Design a binder for these strands. Structure first.
Lengths: 149, 271, 77, 100
RNA sequence: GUUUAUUAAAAACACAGCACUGUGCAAACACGAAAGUGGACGUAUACGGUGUGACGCCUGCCCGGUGCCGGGAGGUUAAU
């Protein structure tokens, strides 16, 4: 494919490469997510002066704004005080919805789709490490303290 | 109990009736009934598809609550009713808020027992709860396939599923026929065995118990014609062939299980 | 029916010529697939049942040109 | 009421949650109108054979006078729990004292 | 009880019972180029096919051929 790239892909993307990829990776991942534009004799002219000169640094400062969105919450901790079972065995397993609502109500305003859970649905009541996908390289180290009630 | 009838006439000799004395003798709860129109084994095209059914006594559909969407609500079992479309009995249960619902009646259930539903349900039989608070090794029924489906497995009379393994978010179950398979741990189940376990002991006595139920007499392949069945023909009780279906598919041993979508869920096949 | 939206492909009839040249009428069916396109000119999802050759044509052309051809032919998108 | 000598083992990270279970069990004892006799926690020590792995389980003795309904409910809370592994209830025999 | 309406009402068909086989639900199977239905608003004490035909005594041998199932070590093996 002659598809020119826009985002910093962690394998072959370095802001302006013409690396040959398959059509299924371009049509289903790069195009609908805005990651890359298929270049056929006019998008090269679009990327030549209008995109690589101005909009690449705009994407870089939007990545810096995502880093600042990570740097909104300086506490980086969430104390969940939901109802629990008798001596452990928590009542309801907390997914990404309640964690995203607790971070959005006080702290980072990131959406639910960037929230990742390394330790499952967090059935164990205690200290847990939760990372956020605010950026493809810089990750979060949120310390969630599940407290039994 | 299971009462064998006396041979007062030719036809009542082999009648063995399963008489439950605790069933309510009266009309059921009317807003939970709807119509159940008979089909006779015919599709929208009007041709017969599932043969050897038709006729019999009429019946009305009872809306039996499968999902148990109420959580944290106590439930007092009002009475027991006989569902004609099932093999086991159903239970009319009056909830705390005043809503009467039909559920599947377990084995250890009488008039006056208290059950509940939700994740805060106990280990007492009759409670419906998801498969992440149940101790591994007990007996469950009304097994849901997907979270929120309602329940597909272990719902006939006497059918029960024992929990074998718990691999993270997967629950490996042993079914009634003996097929090990994995389901989602978020699926719900009702504790205990399904009641009316003596329902297999009825041997129906006569042809009339097959006729008024909906079982039509079955014609053998030897009695048919070569244009009507692959078997048949010959000058007097000649078989001379291999046992097949009337549509040319081999029977008495042929694995037709071919979907290739739920083979990951199946652990060990039926033996 | 089995009509491609972009290329207009439809099933035709042919012969199933065996080793003994036995002419048996059968039907040639196109490789139709219902794929959901992200359109940037409309910024939305468009479900199209198209052929994979039509998918290669859309991979060559722009999606706005394909939607313009569907508008010119009066097809619903 | 009869004297019941309860011995149960607990898993270690759940043996960190033992005193709350002791408070719940003595609340059930107070509901049984019986007096507690042996609050001696034997503690976390080494097992003799592999019993549901991660060795060195937690021994607790109770030894309380209780009726039959309360001990049936307290046995069902034992058998239906992943925390309590190998509980047992024994005879009366004029319930006993120090130097276990 | 039913059957060749219009030469055969029977030992024929069928029958509850018994056995084998398949199927974990969007099930098998069937109608339908397909959608969609029956099965079933049932789900392994259920359904479909086969064989026999209440009940008592029972059902002995053989996997050579054929049919079915399992295993892929090896030989052969088209399409690309």
């Amino acid at each position: 494919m002659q598809v020119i790239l826009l985002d910093k892909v962690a394998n072959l993307g370095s802001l302006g490469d013409q690396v040959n990829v398959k059509a299924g990776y371009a049509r289903n991942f790069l195009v609908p997510q805005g990651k890359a534009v298929p270049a056929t004799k006019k998008n090269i002219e679009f990327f030549e002066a209008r995109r690589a000169e101005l909009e690449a640094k705009l994407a870089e400062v939007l990545a810096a704004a995502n880093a600042r969105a990570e740097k909104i919450n300086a506490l980086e901790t969430v104390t969940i005080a939901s109802k629990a079972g008798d001596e452990g065995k928590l009542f309801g397993s907390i997914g990404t919805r309640d964690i995203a609502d607790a971070v959005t109500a006080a702290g980072v305003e990131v959406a639910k789709s960037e929230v990742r859970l390394p330790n499952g649905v967090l059935r164990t009541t205690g200290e847990h490490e939760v990372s956020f996908q605010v950026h493809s390289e810089v990750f979060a180290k949120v310390i969630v303290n599940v407290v039994a009630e | 109990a299971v009462v064998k009838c006396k041979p007062t006439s030719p036809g009542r000799r082999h009648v063995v009736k399963v008489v439950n004395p605790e069933l309510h003798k009266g009309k059921p709860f009317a807003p939970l009934l709807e119509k159940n129109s008979k089909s006779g084994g015919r599709n929208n095209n009007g041709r017969i598809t599932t043969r050897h059914i038709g006729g019999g006594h009429k019946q009305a559909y009872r809306i039996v609550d499968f999902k148990r969407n109420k959580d944290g609500i106590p439930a007092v079992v009002e009475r027991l009713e006989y569902d004609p479309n099932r093999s086991a009995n159903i239970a009319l249960v009056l909830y705390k808020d005043g809503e009467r619902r039909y559920i599947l009646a377990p084995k250890g259930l009488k008039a006056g027992d208290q059950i509940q539903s939700g994740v805060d349900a106990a280990i007492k039989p009759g409670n419906t709860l998801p498969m992440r608070n149940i101790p591994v090794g007990s007996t469950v029924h009304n097994v849901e396939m997907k979270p929120g489906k309602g329940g597909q497995l272990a719902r006939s009379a006497g059918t029960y599923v024992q929990i074998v393994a718990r691999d993270g978010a997967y629950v490996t179950l042993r079914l009634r026929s003996g097929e090990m398979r994995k389901v989602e741990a978020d699926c719900r189940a009702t504790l205990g065995e399904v009641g009316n376990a003596e329902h297999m002991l009825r041997v129906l006595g006569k042809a009339g118990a097959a006729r008024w139920r909906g079982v039509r007499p079955t014609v053998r392949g030897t009695a048919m014609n070569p244009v009507d069945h692959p078997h048949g023909g010959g000058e007097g009780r000649n078989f001379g062939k291999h046992p097949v279906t009337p549509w040319g598919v081999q029977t008495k041993g042929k694995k037709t299980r071919s979907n290739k979508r739920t083979d990951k869920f199946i652990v060990r096949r039926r033996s | 029916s089995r009509v491609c939206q972009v290329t207009g492909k439809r099933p035709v009839t042919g012969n199933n010529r065996s080793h003994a040249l036995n002419a048996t009428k059968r039907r040639f069916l196109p490789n139709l697939h219902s794929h959901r396109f992200w359109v940037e000119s409309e910024k939305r999802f468009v479900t199209l049942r198209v052929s994979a050759k039509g998918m290669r044509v859309i991979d060559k052309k722009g999606i706005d040109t394909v939607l313009a051809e569907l508008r010119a032919r009066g097809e619903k998108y | 009421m009869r004297h019941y000598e309860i011995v149960f083992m607990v898993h270690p990270d759940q043996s960190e949650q033992v005193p709350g279970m002791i408070e719940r069990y003595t609340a059930a004892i107070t509901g049984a109108e019986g007096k507690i006799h042996r609050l001696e926690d034997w503690g976390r020590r080494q097992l003799a054979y592999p019993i549901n792995k991660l060795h060195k389980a937690h021994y607790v003795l109770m030894n309380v006078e209780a009726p039959q309904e309360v001990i049936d409910e307290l046995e069902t809370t034992f058998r239906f729990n992943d925390a309590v592994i190998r509980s047992m209830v024994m005879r009366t025999k004029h319930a006993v004292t120090e130097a276990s």
